[PDB]
Amino acid sequence: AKLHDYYKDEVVKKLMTEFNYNSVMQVPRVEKITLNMGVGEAIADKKLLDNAAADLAAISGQKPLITKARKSVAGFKIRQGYPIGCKVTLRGERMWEFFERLITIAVPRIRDFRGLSAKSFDGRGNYSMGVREQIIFPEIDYDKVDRVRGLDITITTTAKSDEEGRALLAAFDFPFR
Amino acid sequence: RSLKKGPFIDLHLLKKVEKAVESGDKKPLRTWSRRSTIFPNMIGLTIAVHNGRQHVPVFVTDEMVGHKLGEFAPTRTYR
Amino acid sequence: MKKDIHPKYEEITASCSCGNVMKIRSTVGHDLNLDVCSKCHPFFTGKQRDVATGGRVDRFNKRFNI
Amino acid sequence: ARIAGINIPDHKHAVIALTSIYGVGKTRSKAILAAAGIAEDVKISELSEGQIDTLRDEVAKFVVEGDLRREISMSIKRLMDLGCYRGLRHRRGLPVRGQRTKTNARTRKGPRKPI
RNA sequence: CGCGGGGUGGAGCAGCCUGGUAGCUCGUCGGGCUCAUAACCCGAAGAUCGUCGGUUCAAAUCCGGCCCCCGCAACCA
RNA sequence: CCAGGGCUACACACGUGCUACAAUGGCGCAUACAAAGAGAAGCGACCUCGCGAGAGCAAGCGGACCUCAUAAAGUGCGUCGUAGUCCGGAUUGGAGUCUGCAACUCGACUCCAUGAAGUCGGAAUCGCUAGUAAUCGUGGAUCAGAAUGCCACGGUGAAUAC
RNA sequence: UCCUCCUAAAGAGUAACGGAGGAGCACGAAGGUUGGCUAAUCCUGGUCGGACAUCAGGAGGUUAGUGCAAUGGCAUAAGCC
Ligand SMILES: [Mg+2]
Ligand SMILES: [Mg+2]
Ligand SMILES: [Mg+2]
Ligand SMILES: [Mg+2]
Ligand SMILES: [Mg+2]
Ligand SMILES: [Mg+2]
Ligand SMILES: [Mg+2]
Ligand SMILES: [Mg+2]
Ligand SMILES: [Mg+2]
Ligand SMILES: [Mg+2]
Ligand SMILES: [Mg+2]
Ligand SMILES: [Mg+2]
Ligand SMILES: [Mg+2]
Ligand SMILES: [Mg+2]
Ligand SMILES: [Mg+2]
Ligand SMILES: [Mg+2]
Ligand SMILES: [Mg+2]
Ligand SMILES: [Mg+2]
Ligand SMILES: [Mg+2]
Ligand SMILES: [Mg+2]
Ligand SMILES: [Mg+2]
Ligand SMILES: [Mg+2]
Ligand SMILES: [Mg+2]
Ligand SMILES: [Mg+2]
Ligand SMILES: [Mg+2]
Ligand SMILES: [Mg+2]
Ligand SMILES: [Mg+2]
Ligand SMILES: [Mg+2]
Ligand SMILES: [Mg+2]
Ligand SMILES: [Mg+2]
Ligand SMILES: [Mg+2]
Ligand SMILES: [Mg+2]
Ligand SMILES: [Mg+2]
Ligand SMILES: [Mg+2]
Ligand SMILES: [Mg+2]
Ligand SMILES: [Mg+2]
Ligand SMILES: [Mg+2]
Ligand SMILES: [Mg+2]
Ligand SMILES: [Mg+2]
Ligand SMILES: [Mg+2]
Ligand SMILES: [Mg+2]
Ligand SMILES: [Mg+2]
Ligand SMILES: [Mg+2]
Ligand SMILES: [Mg+2]
Ligand SMILES: [Mg+2]
Ligand SMILES: [Mg+2]
Ligand SMILES: [Mg+2]
Ligand SMILES: [Mg+2]
Ligand SMILES: [Mg+2]
Ligand SMILES: [Mg+2]
Ligand SMILES: [Mg+2]
Ligand SMILES: [Mg+2]
Ligand SMILES: [Mg+2]
């Protein structure tokens, strides 16, 4: 909630001066944050997925989508329409709420932390983080989980170059290398 | 590691280095003193330490100081 | 959002040992207790202390001193 | 029960709790609780949050966890870049402190192999 | 040339028929017992399945080609 | 005759040890009781400096005089409560200490952090008949320094031999 | 015996011990209809995670898919929900 109001007032006005934008709509805005959890090991144990779903459902507000396998492949021993991973595509109000909770409290709790990667952009301003542990978020109780599992966060923007997209996230006091 | 009463170098190597450094860079110094430490003034020189049967050239860098000369000259060859 | 299927997304007060009080909204319960935040974490000093570790020549001079 | 990087023990004495931190052992942990002014006989469940904050600043003095791990990784990696006897010892996977390598050295060399 | 059947650790055999993680008996290797060798007891390694290909999500196993190897036919004047 | 290097190499195999895998144990704080040695470029108090190896000052003794030398198991309280654990203490990084012209190949010990295998061991197989086995210290010889070996010493102290 | 392609000479048909492949079923949802959707394969970033499982954007545009051969056909989608 607060970062959306902060963005509207403080960030836009900061980004308008950098690349001398003609319009207020030209500024990059954050479209959606897609959390992803390719549990994978659900081939052997079916409940292990339902454990991951509950953990994503804890981490994010909303309940995740169980994502089916797109094609069958021999390398992992999986078939067409088999539940292999989990996802959440949170956006709008709960997204800004999650985005504060991520950068403000969770990202600091990363073990062996130093500085997040500046090179990590797709060439179209869309960022992605890879969190090793679920424990970094304070939603998970310590004596509940029993697996070194994690997720990946994926910040989607309306930017055009990673150069342009860096400033957007940098304006939120986002930690880079 | 031993020795708190001054880091140890052989008289002959100290005088040979002091004579080499003041004159300028030239060639690998034949030295048999592996026991001798490496001073800061030795940086730049490509001194040739005796491995046992021959002399191994060692270009002395900023990190090679507290370490002794024999550390950069493997004696026993294997495979 | 689909009501019923989601968990309870309630408001809560984060309060670290540093002193930074901060209300947020999440699926936890009653209250929170934290170690570090975006403020108070050693990254601005961390990178200053971590990079300036090396130094072999002065370490030699500190022993000999002549 | 969340100081430094990790430290999350329970039903364990405060002196033995802090051994679980990487970079803090038996004697260091007694120096923490001596400076903080906490009894060794108590446990973390018994302790309050007002006392745990003092332990956080105390272990911040010593180099611990990822700070230490990099300091060790740097010092080992330094030796290998020099190409000194110890560096060759490290990268070849053989014991460093002038040890016997003929019969034993199984810790450093690893388990048994065929011929 | 024609129709069956084969080709799998160093050897001889299963596994193929119904595609999904290759056994058995010897031999080789390490250790025991013995004065020593054998026998015996105890562990262990060792085959991508003739080869070139296709089908398939995946081939020792399905399907053709190429080279084997082996059987049966190769007849009436 | 001399400088270094090597006898200390390491896919592996065996011999002999030691330390383990714990709760009859581990860790603290208390305190019990030995013997046999050894010592003059020797053994080195006591006092100070040391977190500790040790560093100074130096008492005494060629010794039932002085010194190395508080024996440890053992009691007595505490605390961990069966965990790869407050078990194990390997391995590595750093900081050192003495000896010694010199410690990197290649020493010993200390401190700090690190915390590997290992949960009583396949076929086999060894010693031991009482102050013996078992377990806990201790000394000496060689020795500038360098024992888990060797050679001695004494604690608690069994089972079984039809 | 049946299906698909070529032989088959731009309607149909057309032989050979001519050239290549399939069928002897499957499905109460894989039918009906209504309302939606768009694919392959790469590129770059991202925890374990690697060429490839799951995510994001970009590139391509039907090389895809069509219960099973081949043919003709399908975005109005006959495709996937
Ligand atoms: Mg050679
Ligand atoms: Mg220790
Ligand atoms: Mg030793
Ligand atoms: Mg050696
Ligand atoms: Mg054969
Ligand atoms: Mg089968
Ligand atoms: Mg056999
Ligand atoms: Mg086998
Ligand atoms: Mg197979
Ligand atoms: Mg074939
Ligand atoms: Mg020898
Ligand atoms: Mg040695
Ligand atoms: Mg053995
Ligand atoms: Mg013990
Ligand atoms: Mg006496
Ligand atoms: Mg005395
Ligand atoms: Mg004394
Ligand atoms: Mg005293
Ligand atoms: Mg003294
Ligand atoms: Mg005497
Ligand atoms: Mg007297
Ligand atoms: Mg003594
Ligand atoms: Mg006791
Ligand atoms: Mg005791
Ligand atoms: Mg146990
Ligand atoms: Mg284990
Ligand atoms: Mg211990
Ligand atoms: Mg441990
Ligand atoms: Mg036992
Ligand atoms: Mg037994
Ligand atoms: Mg047995
Ligand atoms: Mg037996
Ligand atoms: Mg016997
Ligand atoms: Mg007898
Ligand atoms: Mg003994
Ligand atoms: Mg002793
Ligand atoms: Mg003596
Ligand atoms: Mg001894
Ligand atoms: Mg008919
Ligand atoms: Mg035609
Ligand atoms: Mg026609
Ligand atoms: Mg015609
Ligand atoms: Mg015809
Ligand atoms: Mg047919
Ligand atoms: Mg349907
Ligand atoms: Mg359906
Ligand atoms: Mg249909
Ligand atoms: Mg429709
Ligand atoms: Mg309707
Ligand atoms: Mg097609
Ligand atoms: Mg078609
Ligand atoms: Mg056409
Ligand atoms: Mg239909």
PDB file of N, CA and C (backbone and C1' of nucleotides) and ligand atoms in Angstrom, chain F residues 45-46 67-68 70, ligand 16:
ATOM      1  P     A F  45      60.763 -23.432  37.287  1.00  0.00           P
ATOM      2  O5'   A F  45      60.041 -23.705  38.680  1.00  0.00           O
ATOM      3  C5'   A F  45      59.827 -22.659  39.642  1.00  0.00           C
ATOM      4  C4'   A F  45      60.182 -23.142  41.027  1.00  0.00           C
ATOM      5  C3'   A F  45      59.429 -22.443  42.153  1.00  0.00           C
ATOM      6  O3'   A F  45      58.133 -22.993  42.383  1.00  0.00           O
ATOM      7  C1'   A F  45      61.752 -22.522  42.664  1.00  0.00           C
ATOM      8  P     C F  46      56.811 -22.093  42.173  1.00  0.00           P
ATOM      9  O5'   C F  46      57.067 -20.828  43.109  1.00  0.00           O
ATOM     10  C5'   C F  46      57.171 -20.957  44.540  1.00  0.00           C
ATOM     11  C4'   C F  46      57.884 -19.762  45.137  1.00  0.00           C
ATOM     12  C3'   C F  46      57.277 -18.397  44.849  1.00  0.00           C
ATOM     13  O3'   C F  46      56.248 -18.114  45.796  1.00  0.00           O
ATOM     14  C1'   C F  46      59.620 -18.318  44.502  1.00  0.00           C
ATOM     15  P     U F  67      61.965 -27.537  46.311  1.00  0.00           P
ATOM     16  O5'   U F  67      61.893 -27.505  44.717  1.00  0.00           O
ATOM     17  C5'   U F  67      62.569 -26.497  43.935  1.00  0.00           C
ATOM     18  C4'   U F  67      62.929 -27.030  42.568  1.00  0.00           C
ATOM     19  C3'   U F  67      61.885 -27.897  41.885  1.00  0.00           C
ATOM     20  O3'   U F  67      60.848 -27.093  41.338  1.00  0.00           O
ATOM     21  C1'   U F  67      64.013 -28.892  41.647  1.00  0.00           C
ATOM     22  P     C F  68      59.483 -27.768  40.857  1.00  0.00           P
ATOM     23  O5'   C F  68      59.945 -28.647  39.613  1.00  0.00           O
ATOM     24  C5'   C F  68      60.075 -28.098  38.286  1.00  0.00           C
ATOM     25  C4'   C F  68      60.160 -29.214  37.271  1.00  0.00           C
ATOM     26  C3'   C F  68      58.942 -30.125  37.196  1.00  0.00           C
ATOM     27  O3'   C F  68      57.933 -29.560  36.359  1.00  0.00           O
ATOM     28  C1'   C F  68      60.928 -31.434  37.294  1.00  0.00           C
ATOM     29  P     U F  70      54.113 -29.219  42.834  1.00  0.00           P
ATOM     30  O5'   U F  70      52.796 -29.787  43.535  1.00  0.00           O
ATOM     31  C5'   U F  70      52.287 -31.112  43.266  1.00  0.00           C
ATOM     32  C4'   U F  70      50.792 -31.168  43.501  1.00  0.00           C
ATOM     33  C3'   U F  70      50.115 -32.457  43.050  1.00  0.00           C
ATOM     34  O3'   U F  70      50.009 -33.410  44.105  1.00  0.00           O
ATOM     35  C1'   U F  70      49.122 -30.640  41.930  1.00  0.00           C
TER      36        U F  70
HETATM   37 MG    MG H  16      57.096 -25.848  44.289  1.00  0.00          MG
END
